Every structure is written in C-alpha cells, then in structure tokens.
Amino acid sequence: DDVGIMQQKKPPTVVQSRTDVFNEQFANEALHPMTKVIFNGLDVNTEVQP
C-alpha cells in the first residue's frame, strides 16, 4: 500500500467508434483486459504547480 515511483505497464488504450454511422461487427477483440477511449488524443492538463 504505497505510491509507486517507477513507471508501470499498460494494455494499452485504443480509440474506436465516433461518427454517426458505425455498422460494427465485433470480430476479433482478444479477450485480454484492455482499454478503449472514445475521444482521440485527450489527456489535456499541462499545468504544473511547484
């Protein structure tokens, strides 16, 4: 129970469905625990407070 210093490991996250017509099929998918983000290239918080 403590905050790690060395960087960890990731799935890693992937973008998918956005537009107003999909027609997805659900082929493949791996079955391993992963992450899927809706918006492309987010993670915006560049402010650093010393």
């Binding site: 790690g4 060395m6 960087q7 960890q8």
Partner: peptide, 27 residues
C-alpha cells in the same frame, strides 16, 4: 531504475556419483 520489471528463479539440484575414499574410519 526506470521501469519496474519481474524475474523468475527455480531452486537448483546438484549431485555426483558417490566417490571413492581410501581412508578408514573406525577401529
């Protein structure tokens, strides 16, 4: 140092054939 990793080990087993000695023990 940079990235946290994981390693593995397995306890080893060492044995030779029973060697020959020329020195006696008891009377």
């Amino acid at each position: 140092a940079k990235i946290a990793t994981a390693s593995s080990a397995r306890q080893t087993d060492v044995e030779k054939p029973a060697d020959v000695t020329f020195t006696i023990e008891n009377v």
